[PDB]
């Protein structure tokens, strides 16, 4: 056969395993037949071009559908009253009741209401008409085309890059810091000053107007005179109606701090100043490394030079330059870990400090965004650790890493793993024990016997930032502090106004329930890290299979000898962490959603009192809030939430289906499929047809993967339904 053209070992398989494994190994270029390093890098380059094109097409489709089937123009008038519609529904399975139930957007056809916040995002950017969105979609289609053409072109013989080019670290770092990050954020500041702020003040400025419209009455004279403070004079009044000229100012760069009163989002002038500042900082940072001139550093020199003379790190960072440059898996792990941290940061900061107008009052949108980015964060972290393990299996050279930090990590992996295990057990034992103690006492009717620990440390941090709710008087809660006096005339007025009003999510008040759920989160993070770190460090070998690097990253097992060696691979560690990552992100999002739901209804006391025992979560969060969702459709009718109820049950179904692949293993199914093949061959009128691929059971690793995928899809879809439907049915 020639389906897995990249593997004859699969092309010669006489079973369906060939098809399955050709699917699942299509992108492991390194393992493909006759794969050279130049071909590997060039294929990755072209694939990156294709991926960028796909992203551009996806965003273009979003814009096009909001422009065509959307209510953006009638949403920019009363954004706090009109629900934003994502796209129209055309399903030939809908009944008249369903069509009517989904015509909620005042559009006269069934629609979906967007939960992505693109409406608020674009309105803040400066989009006002549907023609603006359509032009954006046209440009993004053009950009997808350009990047597809670039990907095709750079696979041509005279345009294929070389490895001396792919491994050029200094020039790529300089260009990515200076141009991709720095000048890109500078251009975003330019957009925010030339379009977004005038649009937020009711002055339309576009391609036909931006070359004659001054972003500031003084023009660029304050810039080219050193009188930069003239760009902060006359900010927008507190009575500014976003999108209109009533209450607007003339400042383009400010550091007011806090939130705009009407929009309850950060000041656009503050955002513009932020982007300009980080742009110049990144431009400076992108001039650090040596390129075709004499100025700059060399990362190899720095890494080799950094060795503490005490010798507590050994050879320090010698050889890491070659290790990282020659291992794409090391780079992949670093990038994935950093992007995961940054997307968790995006979730956290985007709720505590909303940047888009009126997004804070879109409760379902905020919850959906937070859950989305937290789940993405967890996936990225799991992937980073998985690719670290893959690097250890494939790209690690001990002789090159003779007694540097990496070899030392491997040296004391036992200490690392054992202490990680101890801290996991510590956290788990005691957090679960406190929860059970509270459960039992409250059950016996003695809630006064609960162990409720005030999160005084986090409360102290809040007070240091300027929260006066808790009486600490530390740094910014103190009016006579040097920290207060230093920033009293820049941002502290607005920042204090934001922190000390209970109308926002900035530094929400916390209590013993928050303490307990935080330590549950600590347990989850530590146990996921335990599984992943153990997998990575034992990937090359353990005492059970001391030659694991020979077998690779994702082999099924080593047989029933030596006591049994099920799940003895680093892939299995990934497979096992993914359960735990899902658990932990579930805990995180449960906490976020319940706290915010209680605050939104104003009964924060419900969380403060029921968060201390697990029955409180099971009753006052899940059972209580599932009512509208499970009533999406019922014997007495249906509403728009029927889709979310159906998807809730869908997630339950696929979750339980994954249980099948995770509990039932291969031999049973193989001995059953044998009987099935016998029956087919022996049945008249159906033995006229024969399989071209011998029907076999699924492999061990394949079954683990399929069960994990079903489990994950059920997890995600069940919670997505619950969160969106409950938020939309409660508010």
């Amino acid at each position: 056969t020639k389906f897995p053209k990249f593997s004859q070992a699969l092309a010669q398989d006489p079973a369906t395993r060939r098809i399955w494994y050709g699917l699942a190994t299509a992108h492991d270029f390194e393992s493909h037949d006759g794969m050279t390093e130049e071909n590997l890098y060039q294929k990755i380059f072209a694939s990156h071009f294709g991926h960028l094109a796909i992203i551009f097409l996806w965003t273009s489709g979003n814009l096009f559908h909001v422009a065509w089937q959307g209510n953006f123009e009638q949403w920019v008038l009363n954004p706090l009253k009109v629900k934003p519609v994502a796209h129209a529904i055309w399903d030939p399975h809908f009944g008249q009741p369903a069509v009517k139930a989904f015509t909620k957007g005042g559009v006269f056809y069934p629609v979906n209401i967007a939960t992505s916040g693109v409406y608020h995002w674009w309105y803040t950017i400066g989009m006002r008409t549907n023609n603006d969105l359509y032009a954006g979609s046209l440009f993004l289609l053009f950009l997808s085309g350009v990047f597809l053409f670039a990907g095709w072109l750079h696979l041509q013989p005279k345009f294929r890059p070389g490895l001396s080019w792919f491994k050029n670290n200094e020039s790529r770092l300089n260009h990515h810091l200076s141009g991709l990050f720095g000048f890109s954020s500078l251009a975003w500041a330019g957009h925010l000053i030339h379009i977004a702020i005038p649009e937020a003040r009711g002055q339309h400025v576009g391609w036909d107007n931006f070359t004659k419209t001054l972003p500031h009455p003084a023009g660029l004279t304050p810039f080219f005179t050193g009188n930069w403070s003239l760009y902060a004079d006359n900010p927008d009044t507190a009575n500014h109606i976003f999108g209109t000229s009533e209450g607007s100012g003339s400042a383009i760069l400010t550091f007011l701090g806090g939130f705009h009163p009407q929009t309850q989002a950060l000041w656009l002038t503050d955002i513009a100043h932020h982007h300009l500042a980080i742009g110049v900082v990144f431009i400076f940072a992108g001039h650090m490394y040596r390129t075709n001139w004499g100025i700059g550093h060399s990362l190899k020199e720095i890494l080799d030079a950094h060795r503490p003379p005490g010798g507590r790190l050994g050879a320090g960072h010698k050889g890491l330059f070659e290790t990282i440059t020659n291992s794409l898996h090391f780079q992949l792990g670093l990038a994935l870990a950093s992007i995961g941290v940054i997307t968790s940061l995006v979730a956290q900061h985007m709720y505590a400090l909303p940047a888009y107008a009126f997004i804070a009052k879109d409760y379902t949108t905020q919850a959906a965004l937070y859950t989305h980015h937290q789940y993405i964060a967890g996936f990225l972290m799991v992937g980073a650790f998985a690719h670290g393990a893959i690097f250890f299996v494939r790209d690690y050279d001990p002789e090159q890493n003779k007694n540097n930090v990496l070899a030392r990590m491997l040296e004391h992996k036992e200490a690392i793993i054992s202490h990680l295990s101890w801290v996991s057990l510590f956290l788990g034992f005691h957090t679960l024990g406190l929860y059970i103690h509270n459960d039992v006492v409250v059950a016996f009717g003695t809630p006064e016997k609960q162990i409720l620990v005030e999160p005084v440390f986090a409360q102290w941090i809040q007070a240091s930032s300027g929260k006066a709710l808790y009486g600490f008087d530390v740094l910014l809660s103190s009016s006579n502090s040097v920290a207060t006096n230093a920033s009293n005339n820049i941002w502290l007025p607005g920042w204090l106004d934001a922190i000390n009003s209970g109308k926002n999510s900035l530094f929400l008040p916390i209590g013993p329930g928050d303490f307990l759920v935080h330590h549950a989160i600590a347990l989850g993070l530590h146990t996921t890290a335990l599984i992943l770190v153990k997998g990575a460090l034992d990937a090359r070998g353990s005492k059970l299979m001391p030659d694991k690097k020979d077998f690779g990253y994702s082999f099924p097992c080593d047989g029933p000898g030596r006591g049994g060696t099920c799940d003895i691979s680093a892939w299995d560690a990934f497979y096992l962490s993914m359960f735990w990552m899902l658990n932990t992100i579930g805990w995180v999002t449960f906490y976020w959603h319940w706290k915010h739901v209680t605050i939104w209804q104003g009964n924060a006391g419900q969380f403060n009192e029921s968060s201390t025992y697990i029955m409180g979560w099971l009753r006052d969060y899940l059972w209580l809030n599932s009512s509208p969702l499970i009533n999406g459709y019922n014997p007495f009718g249906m509403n728009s939430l029927a889709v979310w109820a159906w998807m809730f049950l869908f997630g339950h179904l696929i979750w339980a289906t994954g249980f099948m692949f995770l509990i039932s293993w291969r031999g049973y199914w193989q001995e059953l499929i044998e009987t099935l093949a016998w029956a087919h061959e022996r049945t008249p009128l159906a033995n006229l047809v024969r399989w071209k691929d011998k029907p076999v059971a699924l492999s061990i690793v394949q079954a683990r993967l399929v069960g994990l995928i079903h489990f994950t899809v059920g997890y995600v879809f069940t919670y997505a339904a619950f969160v969106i439907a409950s938020t939309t049915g409660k508010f």
Partner: peptide, 30 residues
């Protein structure tokens, strides 16, 4: 508000991008 001519221009750009995507897919499959 979005006219059929506009939707048609969008479709033409989509078709061009599809052609380029097929080209890139071929070049990658090699």
């Amino acid at each position: 508000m979005i006219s059929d001519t506009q939707i048609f221009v969008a479709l033409i750009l989509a078709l061009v991008s599809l052609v380029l995507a097929i080209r890139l897919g071929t070049a990658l499959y090699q």
